[PDB]
Design a protein around this ligand. Structure first.
Ligand SMILES: [Mg+2]
Ligand SMILES: [Mg+2]
Ligand SMILES: [Mg+2]
Ligand SMILES: [Mg+2]
Ligand SMILES: [Mg+2]
Ligand SMILES: [Mg+2]
Ligand SMILES: [Mg+2]
Ligand SMILES: [Mg+2]
Ligand SMILES: [Mg+2]
Ligand SMILES: [Mg+2]
Ligand SMILES: [Mg+2]
Ligand SMILES: [Mg+2]
Ligand SMILES: [Mg+2]
Ligand SMILES: [Mg+2]
Ligand SMILES: [Mg+2]
Ligand SMILES: [Mg+2]
Ligand SMILES: [Mg+2]
Ligand SMILES: [Mg+2]
Ligand SMILES: [Mg+2]
Ligand SMILES: [Mg+2]
Ligand SMILES: [Mg+2]
Ligand SMILES: [Mg+2]
Ligand SMILES: [Mg+2]
Ligand SMILES: [Mg+2]
Ligand SMILES: [Mg+2]
Ligand SMILES: [Mg+2]
Ligand SMILES: [Mg+2]
Ligand SMILES: [Mg+2]
Ligand SMILES: [Mg+2]
Ligand SMILES: [Mg+2]
Ligand SMILES: [Mg+2]
Ligand SMILES: [Mg+2]
Ligand SMILES: [Mg+2]
Ligand SMILES: [Mg+2]
Ligand SMILES: [Mg+2]
Ligand SMILES: [Mg+2]
Ligand SMILES: [Mg+2]
Ligand SMILES: [Mg+2]
Ligand SMILES: [Mg+2]
Ligand SMILES: [Mg+2]
Ligand SMILES: [Mg+2]
Ligand SMILES: [Mg+2]
Ligand SMILES: [Mg+2]
Ligand SMILES: [Mg+2]
Ligand SMILES: [Mg+2]
Ligand SMILES: [Mg+2]
Ligand SMILES: [Mg+2]
Ligand SMILES: [Mg+2]
Ligand SMILES: [Mg+2]
Ligand SMILES: [Mg+2]
Ligand SMILES: [Mg+2]
Ligand SMILES: [Mg+2]
Ligand SMILES: [Mg+2]
Ligand SMILES: [Mg+2]
Ligand SMILES: [Mg+2]
Ligand SMILES: [Mg+2]
Lengths: 148, 185, 53, 51, 124, 228, 157
RNA sequence: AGCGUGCUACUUAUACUUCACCGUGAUUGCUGUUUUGACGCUUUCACGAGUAGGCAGGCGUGGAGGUCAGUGACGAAGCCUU
RNA sequence: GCCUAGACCGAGGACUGCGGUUUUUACCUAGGAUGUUGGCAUAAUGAUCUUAAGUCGCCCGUCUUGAAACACGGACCAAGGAGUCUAACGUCUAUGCGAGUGUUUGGGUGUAAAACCCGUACGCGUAAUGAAAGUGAACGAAGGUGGGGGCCCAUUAGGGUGCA
């Protein structure tokens, strides 16, 4: 709303809050990102280091679909078990019958190993796993089954 | 004339009321304005200040924090007090039976307190079973984990986050971030 | 001074009395009586001007 | 609501200092001193008159 | 003081606060405007210049808003507007709006006299 | 009306008991004031006797150097160098005609020496101290300037320092006592008027050269008589 | 003015005054005001008239008579601050002024027969004592005025 | 009624002292008497210069939702007026 | 210790306090002016306007270290007349939900540009780091130490537990 802006309160004061010496001018200092190497170096060096220069190799025609691999950690892995049957599975799971967790079918590419698992065997289906994630799954008596 | 040793006409710099115009938050302040004014209990004076805090000054307290706070020695049956929202944590393996008084509960949080035998009460229900805050335990959420705090106090060799819209190798990584491109700060 | 204060405090505890350990700034001097045996006051006057070159 | 000077209001003076009553009753402000009609400066203190 | 008793009414400044140079130029109206000029003799408070509004002239909170008879004046449009002054007839007075017709104004004056409300503008 | 008469009777009984208890406290402060008067007179006569004896015995009695000073800021708040400004602020002299009591030591003497071109100070007599405390004496209670109109204010703020009366406070100031700091800091700086009779023709020069600043010593009492 | 309604909490009850501790104390008259003193009236109808002071009424006023035959100034009250107390005195020990008080001068043109009788009874003794001092009756019958070069700060009365 | 110097009294700033009132900041207390206002009431103390500039609290205008079953051809708005 | 001349002021509004006198569960000068008398209400009293007198008062706005300036605009008056909207953002605040969140691209529906309803994806978040190939977050109660509000046991003190 315009009735809340300070332009309405500056009415009657000569300079409208812009100063009498400095005044409000068209473009003192330039337009946009002007002077980044000469007189705005002190700004870009302090607040945006790394701005100028080249780093790394280019990639012509990069399709981000190739690199799709959403991550799921171990502390969030049991949220993929059916909510209505989570508590029963946590009790009756054994080596003879353990829940199957299809991580790819839920939209995840790699299983990572953050957190701690319940001491309960599980069968985890993943495209990729980390070394420690699979070590923790085997320790609770589970297994990782690679899919594609 | 006076030689002033301090600045004149200085506001206290602390909130004396919520900025919110929610009438129901006013009633809780009403109740604890009376309690802090009349009980000499330090618990009620702390709560009155906490009811004034802004959204970033009352971070959510996860149900995992309550589990960890109840795991202190001799604190298993204390009353957990959260001036704010209590959120769920799907990374917990188990939750105890506990009594928790909070401004708000999420659907997952309430489902977890009652499933494990606990109670999820409001701060007015707290004031009758504990008008002096006896056997209570105030829990506050992490304030410095916010993303906005990542950019606070940014400077050379400060280790803070650049204020940037996109992230990648072409975005503020070459000169001033790398010794092969001049210097590194 | 820490050691001296500790020694004074323990000796006062041993004697069952008290000792004050805070330092004090110099205070104005007390009253006193000036004897004039051999020291009868000598009268001085400002001296006249002379040139010594 | 109004500060009253104990040096003007006698009742306030007695409120603050009850001993003022005894001071008034005993005439402590005009108390005589009992002493001898001596003059001990007859000797060497006449060094003040001349030297 | 036919109204509820009040302290003596003090008006710290009784003249109008007139805008600087509203007397020199017709385009400058007497409605007060604060001078903002760098060299202004009035903004810098030179001796001999006009008085200016400041919070020191504020009215005593016990005599504030009281007319010479000791009443606070409430604007009345229709006869139902006098109902809010039923329990305040000795501290609040009614003022009839200029746009009330000659018919309704007579009814308001008649009911106000019945209700005991005092009327500040009884002739018009 | 019934409730008012019931509470009035209860108040009357409680006030009867309170007055009975306070009578003893007033006897205590009466005895203390009488003892203070006795020791003042005895010390004065002792000093007079010592002076007379030293005069008789071809000796010279040297008075004990004053332990207390009353400092009045007679200079405005404009054009003060940073160090004397800070010194005047630390003496709580932040306005013209502000007075404060200072216990003389080396530290406080070098403080007063720094403020010397802007203040007039001296050695106050007992009657001057009494007049100051009676007419313009105020206490700092919860950071508020409260008139010393009743001995209960002094008791409530200095009873842990054995000050139960205005005369206890005056005695503690005059004969500089073990709790002089607390007693003088409880006293709000005295706000005096201008002198009746004026200053000298030009204030801001030392008292020795015909001005008003610096140490005037016992004539501070006359100056306080002009300003209080 | 505006349309600001009175509120329900705006009470109209008048509080009682606090209990005042201004207990009145008696009037202290000037040392020069002694019954029988000749006074000069400075204001009022009888301004400039020299009159005899008779009694101190309980109203803080002074009972005064001309006497009426000499001056035309009757028995009445005056205020002590509108009077110059001279040094001339008349022996009024033989004048009965017991019946004179505030209620005598109560407001009820005509004149009471009682008041005329009292005028004569008082004036008989007043004239008898006035004749003893020569020129005192003539002095009382003459009006007072300030002549050129009269300085009241230097004159004795 | 000049120059050097001493003395008595006197003159008066928005400065100082006491007091009234305005505002700001703090401060005392207020729910079995909280009693149809607690965004409210109340005790006390200190303080008040200000360009550029910041913030806060308000006044006024065209038009809009709701409400006053508001004013009005028995005269709205506008305009002139010790 | 005592007497005495004058000026200005009278905030507060049942009681509550401290003293004093105690002749007394009473009185007082002691937590802020009362008593009495006269006059006036066709008015003494107060305000404004105009004008006279006394005293002071240079033309505003602007740039400037410095303006009444022999610096610039302005003869006068009325009406108009200048920090806006948008895309994307930083801080702070309020609100809804909360490890998720966003109905409005679209579909349903309608009293039809409104209101009401629906869901897949997608954006942001939930993982970082490296130029990249790639790898990828618990020794321990998700750590120890000194503080740390609050809470618990105590009984000045002291101890326990100690979120941010
Ligand atoms: Mg506005
Ligand atoms: Mg502004
Ligand atoms: Mg400005
Ligand atoms: Mg302009
Ligand atoms: Mg700006
Ligand atoms: Mg400009
Ligand atoms: Mg600029
Ligand atoms: Mg680039
Ligand atoms: Mg000031
Ligand atoms: Mg201060
Ligand atoms: Mg941390
Ligand atoms: Mg981010
Ligand atoms: Mg670029
Ligand atoms: Mg290089
Ligand atoms: Mg005026
Ligand atoms: Mg006006
Ligand atoms: Mg006037
Ligand atoms: Mg202007
Ligand atoms: Mg200037
Ligand atoms: Mg009209
Ligand atoms: Mg009562
Ligand atoms: Mg000091
Ligand atoms: Mg004088
Ligand atoms: Mg002189
Ligand atoms: Mg001079
Ligand atoms: Mg000369
Ligand atoms: Mg002033
Ligand atoms: Mg003034
Ligand atoms: Mg209640
Ligand atoms: Mg200001
Ligand atoms: Mg300003
Ligand atoms: Mg305002
Ligand atoms: Mg509007
Ligand atoms: Mg428009
Ligand atoms: Mg509308
Ligand atoms: Mg109508
Ligand atoms: Mg005209
Ligand atoms: Mg009054
Ligand atoms: Mg007492
Ligand atoms: Mg003139
Ligand atoms: Mg002039
Ligand atoms: Mg220019
Ligand atoms: Mg320029
Ligand atoms: Mg120039
Ligand atoms: Mg100019
Ligand atoms: Mg020139
Ligand atoms: Mg120029
Ligand atoms: Mg130019
Ligand atoms: Mg033009
Ligand atoms: Mg021109
Ligand atoms: Mg012209
Ligand atoms: Mg924004
Ligand atoms: Mg997504
Ligand atoms: Mg999604
Ligand atoms: Mg290792
Ligand atoms: Mg610790």
């Amino acid at each position: 709303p315009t009735r809340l802006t300070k332009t309405r309160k500056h009415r009657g004061n000569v300079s409208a809050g812009k100063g009498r010496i400095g005044k409000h001018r068209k473009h003192p200092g330039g337009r946009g990102k002007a002077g980044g190497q000469h007189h705005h170096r002190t700004n870009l060096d302090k607040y945006h280091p790394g701005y100028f220069g080249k780093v790394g190799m280019r990639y012509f025609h990069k399709q981000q679909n190739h690199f799709w691999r959403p991550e799921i950690n171990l502390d969030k892995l049991w949220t993929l078990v059916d909510s209505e049957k989570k508590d029963e599975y946590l009790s009756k799971s054994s080596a003879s019958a353990a829940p199957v967790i299809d991580t790819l079918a839920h939209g995840y590419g790699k299983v990572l190993g953050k957190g701690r698992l319940p001491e309960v065997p599980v069968i985890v289906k993943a495209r990729f796993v980390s070394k420690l994630a699979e070590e923790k799954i085997r320790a609770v008596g589970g297994v990782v089954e690679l899919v594609a | 004339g006076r030689d002033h040793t301090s600045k004149q006409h200085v506001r206290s710099g602390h909130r004396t009321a919520p900025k919110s115009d929610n009438v129901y938050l006013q009633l809780l302040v009403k109740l604890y304005s009376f309690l802090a004014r009349r009980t000499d209990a330090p618990f009620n004076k702390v709560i009155l200040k906490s009811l004034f805090l802004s959204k970033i000054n009352r971070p959510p307290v996860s149900v995992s924090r309550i589990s960890r706070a109840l795991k202190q020695k001799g604190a298993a049956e204390k009353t957990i007090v959260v001036v704010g929202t209590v959120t769920d944590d799907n990374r917990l393996l188990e939750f105890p039976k506990a009594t928790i008084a909070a401004l708000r509960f999420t659907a997952g949080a309430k489902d977890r307190i009652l499933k494990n035998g606990g109670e999820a009460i409001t701060l007015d229900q707290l004031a009758l079973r504990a008008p002096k805050g006896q056997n209570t335990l105030i829990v506050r959420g992490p304030r410095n984990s916010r993303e906005a705090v990542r950019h606070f106090g940014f400077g050379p060799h400060k280790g803070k986050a650049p204020r940037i819209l996109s992230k990648g190798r072409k975005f503020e990584r070459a000169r001033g971030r790398r010794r092969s491109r001049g210097f590194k700060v | 001074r820490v050691k001296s204060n500790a020694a004074k405090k323990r000796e006062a505890k041993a004697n069952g009395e008290t000792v004050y350990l805070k330092r004090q700034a110099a205070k104005p001097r007390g009253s006193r009586i000036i004897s004039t045996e051999g020291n009868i006051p000598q009268t001085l006057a400002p001296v006249a001007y002379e040139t010594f070159i | 609501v109004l500060k009253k000077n104990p040096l003007k209001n006698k009742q306030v003076l007695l409120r603050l200092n009850p001993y003022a009553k005894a001071y008034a009753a005993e005439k402590v402000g005009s108390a005589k001193v009992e002493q001898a009609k001596v003059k001990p400066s007859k000797g060497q203190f006449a060094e003040v008159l001349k030297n | 003081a036919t109204s509820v008793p009040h302290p003596k009414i003090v008006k710290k400044y009784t003249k109008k606060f007139k805008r600087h140079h509203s007397d020199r130029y017709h385009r400058v109206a007497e409605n007060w405007r604060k001078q903002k000029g760098i060299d202004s003799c009035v903004r810098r408070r030179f001796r001999g210049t006009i008085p200016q509004p400041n919070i020191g002239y504020g009215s005593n909170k016990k005599t504030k808003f009281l007319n010479p008879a000791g009443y606070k004046v409430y604007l009345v449009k229709n006869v139902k507007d006098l109902d809010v002054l039923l329990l305040h007839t000795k501290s609040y007075a009614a003022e009839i709006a200029s746009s009330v017709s000659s018919r309704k104004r007579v009814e308001i004056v008649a009911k106000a006299k019945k209700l005991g409300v005092k009327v500040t503008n009884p002739k018009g | 009306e019934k409730a008012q008469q019931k509470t009035a009777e209860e108040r009357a009984a409680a006030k009867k008991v309170r007055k009975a208890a306070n009578k003893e406290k007033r006897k205590v402060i009466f005895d203390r004031a009488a003892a203070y008067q006795k020791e003042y007179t005895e010390a004065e006569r002792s000093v007079i006797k010592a002076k007379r004896d030293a005069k008789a015995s071809n000796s010279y009695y040297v008075d004990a150097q004053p332990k207390l000073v009353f400092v009045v800021r007679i200079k405005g708040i404009n054009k003060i160098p940073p160090k004397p400004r800070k010194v005047l602020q630390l003496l709580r002299l932040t306005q013209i005609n502000a007075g404060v009591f200072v216990r003389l030591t080396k530290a406080t003497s070098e403080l007063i020496k720094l403020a010397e071109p802007y203040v007039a100070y001296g050695y106050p007599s007992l009657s001057t101290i009494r007049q100051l405390v009676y007419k313009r004496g105020f206490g700092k209670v919860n950071k508020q300037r409260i008139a010393l109109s009743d001995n209960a204010i002094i008791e409530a703020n200095l009873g842990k320092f054995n000050i139960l009366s205005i005369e206890d406070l005056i005695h503690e100031i005059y004969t500089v006592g073990p709790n002089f700091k607390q007693v003088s800091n409880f006293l709000w700086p005295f706000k005096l008027s201008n002198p009746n009779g004026g200053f000298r023709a030009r204030k801001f020069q030392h008292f020795i050269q015909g001005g008003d600043t610096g140490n005037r010593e016992q004539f501070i009492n006359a100056l306080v008589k002009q300003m209080n | 003015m505006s349309q600001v309604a009175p509120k329900w909490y705006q009470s109209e009850d008048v509080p009682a005054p606090k209990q005042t501790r201004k207990t009145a104390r008696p009037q202290k008259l000037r040392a020069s005001l002694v019954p029988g003193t000749v006074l000069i009236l400075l204001a009022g109808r009888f301004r400039g008239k020299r009159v005899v002071y008779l009694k101190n009424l309980e109203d803080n006023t002074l009972l005064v008579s001309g006497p009426f035959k000499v001056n035309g100034v009757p028995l009445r009250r005056v205020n002590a601050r509108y009077v110059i107390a001279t040094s001339t005195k008349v022996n009024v020990s033989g004048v009965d002024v017991s019946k004179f008080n505030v209620e005598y001068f109560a407001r009820e043109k005509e004149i009471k027969a009682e008041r005329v009788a009292d005028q004569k009874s008082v004036d008989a003794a007043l004239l008898s004592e006035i004749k003893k001092t020569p020129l005192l009756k003539q002095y009382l019958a003459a009006s007072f005025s300030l002549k050129n070069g009269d300085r009241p700060h230097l004159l004795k009365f």
